[PDB]
Structure formats: C-alpha cells, structure tokens
C-alpha cells in the first residue's frame, strides 16, 4: 500500500474541492503520467465515502474510450487515493478560453458525438451519470473527450429514487426533476448533454437559473410551458402549479442561430419535455447530424 | 418499455455468472454453518425494517457476505461483524442517505466498536476488490415485472416475498443463479394469485422454459409450503403488513401442475 505511494512523484495540484484534491503525478518506475485523486478519511471518520464507493465500483465496470479510466485504488489507514488517467483540460475552461473565437462547429460536433458514445455505453450498462456538466467533461490535445466524475453515478438494475441534496447543478437539471418526479431515468443525462451542446454553440448557458423556480421559468420561456398534450401527466406532477405562466415556445432557429436544420432537429429531440419521448443516446448517434463527423484537434491555450 | 432494456438484461446475465459465490464454501468453513448464516440474514432483514432500508440493500449485503465467506475463514463471534460491514457498504452503494456508522455499532449491542466496523469495511472492500454493483434477484424481478398482463401489485409483492425467503437458506439456494430464482419466484407468485404461468414473452426474453425453471421451482415451492414452520420468521412478519398486501398470508397451492 505505502510501497505504491512512494512510486509516485507529485508534479502539481490540478484540482481541489469538498471532495479532496487532485494531483498530476508521475510513476517513477514506468514514467507513466497520472492523475491522483486524494480523499481524506479522518474528516468524518464515517468510513469510505459513498461517493468513492459508487465511483470506484461503477467505473471499474466501464471500459470505453470516452470514459475516464480508473487505473488503481490505494487504501492506506487514513488516506484513499484513486489513480486515473490524466487529461490536459476540462470543457468549462476550454469554452471559457474560446469565448472570442468560439468553438469551431466541427469540433462541437465531434465532441457531442464522443459524449453520446460514452453515455450510450454507460446506459447500456445500467449506469446513470446524473451530473453531466462542462467541468466533468475532460479533453486532451489529440481531440478526445471523456465523461469523468462518477461520484453521483448510480446503477439502475433497480429504479433510482430522487434525492433533494444529491442532484445535478441547477443549469443542467432536467424539467422532470424540477417538477418533482419519483425516479430518475436515462432521459436526465440526455437533457444535460443537450444543454451543453447549446452552450458550446452559442457561447452562453441555455438556462442559467437563479433558483429552482427560476430555472423552470427560464425553460418554460424558451421551450414553451408544457401542457397535457405535449407531456401527459405534467399537471399531475408533485411540484407542478396551475398558477404557472403559460409561455409560448420560442422560434428554435433564434435560440441556436448558428445551427443548421440537422442540428436544430437533434437538439429538439434532446430537449423533449416528456422523458419517454426524449431521444436516447444510442438513437441520437444515428441522427443525420453526425453524417460527416470528423475528429479535429482543439487549440488548447495551456 | 425502456430503451436499453435488452442490453441491460444481457449484461446482468453476464455479471451474475461472474459475481457467483463458491457453491460449497460453507463446508470448507471450520466454524460456521448454514444455520448460523440463516440467523444472520434473518437479523439483517430485521435491521432493514428498523432503518427503513430498500429491499435491494438487503439482497446486496447478502451477496457481499456469501462472496467474502467464499474466500475468508470467519469465526462464530466475528460473523456478525462481517454482516454489519456488508450492510454498511450495501447502504452506501444503494441508499440515498445511508444510516451512520454509529447506528451500525448500536444495532450490534456494542458487541463491536466503531473502530472494528470501520476496519472490517476496509477488509470487505479489499476482499471484494471494490466490486459492489452485483446482480440481485430484485434486479431480475424488476425486469420481469414489465411483462405483466396487466400489472398486479399482489403478484409483485408475493414474488418479492419468495425471492426474499430464498436468501435465508444457503442450501439449496446458493446453487441457483439470481435470474433463475427470480424466474421461479415470478411464476409461483403469478400462479398463486392469478392462476397464470410463466408467459411466452419471458421465455423469449430469458430462454428459460418452465421445464428449466422446474428444479428451483420445486425447491421454492417447498420453502413456501414450510415457510410458517421455519425457525426464521422476520420475513413472513415483514410481508403480512399492508404495504405488501399481506401476501405472506396467502395459502400456497398444494401442488404446481407441471
Ligand atoms: C486541470 C484540469 C483542467 C484537468 C484535470 O484535472 N484533468 C484530469 N485528469 N484526470 C482527472 C482529472 C480530473 N479528475 C477528476 O476526478 C475530477 C473531475 C471534475 N470534478 C469536479 C472533481 C474530480 C480525474 C479523472 C482524476
């Protein structure tokens, strides 16, 4: 266990949070570059956190080019280290660095294609990610993008119930969840990806809400206040209110102006109100929008 | 009717063969018996009712236990420490908000320390190589339920009940795959409440015929018959509650007409 830690040379701190720290590091014997995620255990002495349990157990089932590889787990008496492959940057910072130029449309298309492939793999393996946001999407110089951070991920051979606390950040949260539905479905991950597709295209967040009710009204104001025809059941749902403003759907070509007809179609289906009607990752991969997809490399301002 | 429904069943059928405990581990154990185990599981069922945990949590913890005992010699007086750790891990994996360790120490009558429970959590995780996402009888029942014509809450409750009992007795149930136990529990519950049998749609889905389910079926039927005489009773009590339509009170057929 401690033999293993001494074979790593810490290079620099590349990430930090309530979860702990992430170091870039090198294997001194093999030369392998690596990301070490360090979780302190003495902070609650409640044992291994649920968030590590799910990330470790689920990630080691998932081997796919667009899902971050977990390389190893090292468990000492007070520290837990997860060893991951290293990638140069995340989508949030890259979008930010691309503000003046924009992300070229062919790179946007490649990224969405890759993200869907990774998500399809997750879902066909009964894993829900549940926290897809630009900061958990990692990229390298060769042009790949990968789903990362599976601390909130959940196996769903049995249906997964809604927690108030353990949720996607507000801007990427599906309407079903806001409206108080009972179970998560795969549809909630596709909703998140659709929001991110739009943000890459426009250079602004699609639905930057201030609160739960504000997030909803921003969705309603863009996509139209849903009704029983659009979405059977909506008016029954727990947190639905008859006093809701009834907004008309905005012209979709004015929401994502840079997109062609194929792009508009794909995003419509990714943002369908009814979770059962919302397109699946596997079916999205077949959409004509990906007819011509290629694999460009990003200008990483590293 | 899900999107990845087929891909998932296929995946679970793969993983249930890999997470499979050693069939005859109990006799290579120096100190513990099927009976002690049965007492332990019956206890955890009780523990789950106390802290209002999901049924999947229970099934998972039992999977963790059988696998740990598949490779580690455990002594009588440490058996419940293994079981408590399994439940703690199960709760963390599956529950939205797991009970605190302090609760898991309390429910043991301070037979063990917070420190012992935490160390055992580490050792269980090490012995299982962090592979916690195991296929259970519940997971396969959930899949099978989509094939109800129509749904009958009574049938669902009763199948859950039969599957839950099968956890208690390592003999004969260790030698059957979850997908098979699930198949038998579903047919038996269906036949009891509605007089219908294993539907053609599920024969196509699973490849299981009533013929292939038979051995587990005969075993499960006996366990349903002798259920009220069994030394362990926590499950039958659980399932006479209204939450489960009192299905633990239904009288089993005296024969299955095979
Ligand atoms: C410096 C950043 C731009 C890039 C960076 O940290 N890249 C990475 N290479 N490998 C990893 C990360 C980031 N990683 C992570 O696990 C982090 C993902 C984002 N969340 C919010 C915290 C956990 C791993 C998979 C260990």
- Joined together, the tokens standing for residue B223 give 């366990």
Data resolution in angstroms = 2.5
Which CATH code of 1.10.472.10, 3.90.1150.10, 1.10.940.10, 3.30.1360.200 fits the domain covering B7-20+134-258?
A: 1.10.472.10
Kindly state the helix (H) or strand (E) to which residue A193 belongs, with its residue range: helix A187-202
Dist. CA A236–CA A252, nearest whole Å: 28
Is there an atom of ligand 1 within 6 Å of A86 CB? yes
Residue A274 near residue A259, CB atoms below 8 Å: no
Domain boundary among A20, A53, A88: A88
- This entry's atomic model was obtained through X-ray
The full set of domain ranges for chain B reads 7-20+134-258, 21-133
Dist. CA B110–CA B112, nearest whole Å: 5
Q: Are residues A268 and A141 in the same domain?
A: yes
Give φ, ψ of A37 to 5 degrees.
-95, 115
CB contact under 8 A, A282 and B4: yes
Domain boundary among A46, A68, A88: A88
Is there an atom of ligand 1 within 6 Å of A51 CB? no
Domain boundary among A88, A107, A135: A88
Interchain CB contact of A78 with B (< 8 Å): no
Q: Does this chain's domain B7-20+134-258 share its CATH topology with B21-133?
A: yes
Is there an atom of ligand 1 within 6 Å of A14 CB? yes
Pairing of the two strands A70-75 and A79-84: antiparallel
Q: Are residues A208 and A286 in the same domain?
A: yes
Q: Among this protein's residues, is A227 annotated catalytic?
A: no
Q: Are residues A97 and A62 in the same domain?
A: no
| Chain B residues with CB-CB distance to A45 below 8 A | 101, 114, 118
- Fold held by B21-133: Cyclin A; domain 1 (1.10.472)
Dist. CA B220–CA B191, nearest whole Å: 13
Dist. CA A277–CA B245, nearest whole Å: 33
Question: How far, in Å, from the CA of A154 to the mean position of ligand 1?
Answer: 20
Is the CA virtual torsion B72, B75, B79, B80 positive or negative?
A: negative
> Which structural domain range is residue A279 located in?
89-301
Binding region of A for ATP: 14-22, 37, 85-87, 90, 133-136, 149
What is the CA A251 to chain-centroid distance, rounded?
Answer: 27
Atom of ligand 1 nearest to the CA of A87: 9
Pairing of the two strands A33-40 and A79-84: antiparallel
Distance in Å, alpha carbon of A60 to nearest chain B alpha carbon: 8
Atom of ligand 1 nearest to the CA of A138: 7
CB contact under 8 A, A53 and B96: no
CB contact under 8 A, B4 and A46: no
Is there an atom of ligand 1 within 6 Å of A149 CB? yes
Q: Are residues A130 and A268 in the same domain?
A: yes
The residue in chain A having the minimum alpha-carbon distance to the alpha carbon of residue B5 is: A124
Residues constituting chain A: 302
CATH number of the domain where residue A102 is located: 1.10.510.10
Dist. CA A230–CA B237, nearest whole Å: 45
Instruction: Work out how many domains chain A is built from and give that number.
Output: 2
Q: Are residues A52 and A119 in the same domain?
A: no
CATH number of the domain where residue A22 is located: 3.30.200.20
| Chain B residues with CB-CB distance to A49 below 8 A | 92
SS3 A253: helix
Q: Are residues A80 and A196 in the same domain?
A: no
Kindly state the helix (H) or strand (E) to which residue A302 belongs, with its residue range: none
Q: Are residues A33 and A94 in the same domain?
A: no
Q: Are residues A62 and A193 in the same domain?
A: no
């Amino acid at each position: 266990p401690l033999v293993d830690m001494e074979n790593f040379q810490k290079v620099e701190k590349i990430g930090e949070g309530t979860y702990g720290v992430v170091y870039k590091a090198r294997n001194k014997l093999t030369g392998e570059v690596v990301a070490l995620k360090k979780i302190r255990l003495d902070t609650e002495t409640e044992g291994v956190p649920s968030t590590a349990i799910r990330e470790i157990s689920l990630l080691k089932e998932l081997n796919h080019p667009n899902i971050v590889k977990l390389l190893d787990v090292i468990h000492t008496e007070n520290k837990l280290y997860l060893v991951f492959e290293f990638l140069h940057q995340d989508l949030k910072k890259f979008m930010d660095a691309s503000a003046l130029t924009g992300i070229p449309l062919p790179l946007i298309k490649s990224y969405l294609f890759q993200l869907l492939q990774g998500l399809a793999f997750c879902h066909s393996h009964r894993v829900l990610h549940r926290d897809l946001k630009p900061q958990n999407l990692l990229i390298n110089t060769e042009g790949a993008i990968k789903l990362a951070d599976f601390g909130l991920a959940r196996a769903f051979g049995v249906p997964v119930r809604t927690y108030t606390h353990e949720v996607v950040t507000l801007w990427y949260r599906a309407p079903e969840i806001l409206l108080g539905c009972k179970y998560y479905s795969t549809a909630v991950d596709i909703w998140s990806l659709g929001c991110i597709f739009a943000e890459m295209v426009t250079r602004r967040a699609l639905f930057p809400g201030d609160s739960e009710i504000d997030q909803l009204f921003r969705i309603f104001r863009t996509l139209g206040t849903p009704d029983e025809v659009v979405w059977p059941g909506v008016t029954s749902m727990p947190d639905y209110k008859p006093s809701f403003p009834k907004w008309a759907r905005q012209d979709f070509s004015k929401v994502v102006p840079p997109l062609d007809e194929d792009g508009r179609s794909l995003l419509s289906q990714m943002l369908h109100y009814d979770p059962n009607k919302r397109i699946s990752a596997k079916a999205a991969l077949a959409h004509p929008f990906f007819q011509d997809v290629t694999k460009p490399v990003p200008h990483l301002r590293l | 009717v899900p999107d990845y429904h087929e891909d998932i069943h296929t995946y679970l059928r793969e993983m249930e063969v890999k997470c499979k405990p050693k069939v005859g581990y109990m006799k290579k154990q120096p100190d513990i018996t099927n009976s002690m185990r049965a007492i332990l599981v019956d206890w955890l069922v009780e523990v789950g009712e106390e802290y209002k945990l999901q049924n999947e949590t229970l099934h998972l913890a039992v999977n963790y236990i059988d696998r740990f005992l598949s490779s580690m010699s455990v002594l009588r007086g440490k058996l419940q420490l293994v079981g408590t750790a399994a439940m703690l891990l199960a709760s963390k994996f599956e529950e939205i908000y797991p009970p605190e360790v302090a609760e898991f120490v309390y429910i043991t009558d301070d037979t063990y320390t917070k420190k012992q429970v935490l160390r055992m959590e580490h050792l269980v995780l090490k012995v299982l190589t962090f592979d916690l996402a195991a296929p259970t009888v519940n997971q396969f029942l959930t899949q099978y339920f989509l094939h109800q014509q129509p749904a009958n809450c009574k049938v669902e409750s009763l199948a859950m009940f039969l599957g839950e009992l099968s956890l208690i007795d390592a003999d004969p149930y260790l030698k059957y795959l979850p997908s098979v136990i699930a198949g038998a529990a579903f047919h038996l519950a269906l036949y009891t409440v509605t007089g219908q049998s294993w539907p053609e749609s599920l024969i196509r889905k699973t490849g299981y015929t009533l013929e292939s389910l038979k051995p587990c079926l005969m075993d499960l039927h006996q366990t349903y018959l002798k259920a009220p005489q069994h030394a362990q009773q926590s499950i039958r009590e659980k399932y006479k509650n209204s939450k489960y339509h009192g299905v633990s009170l239904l009288n089993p057929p005296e024969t299955l007409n095979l």
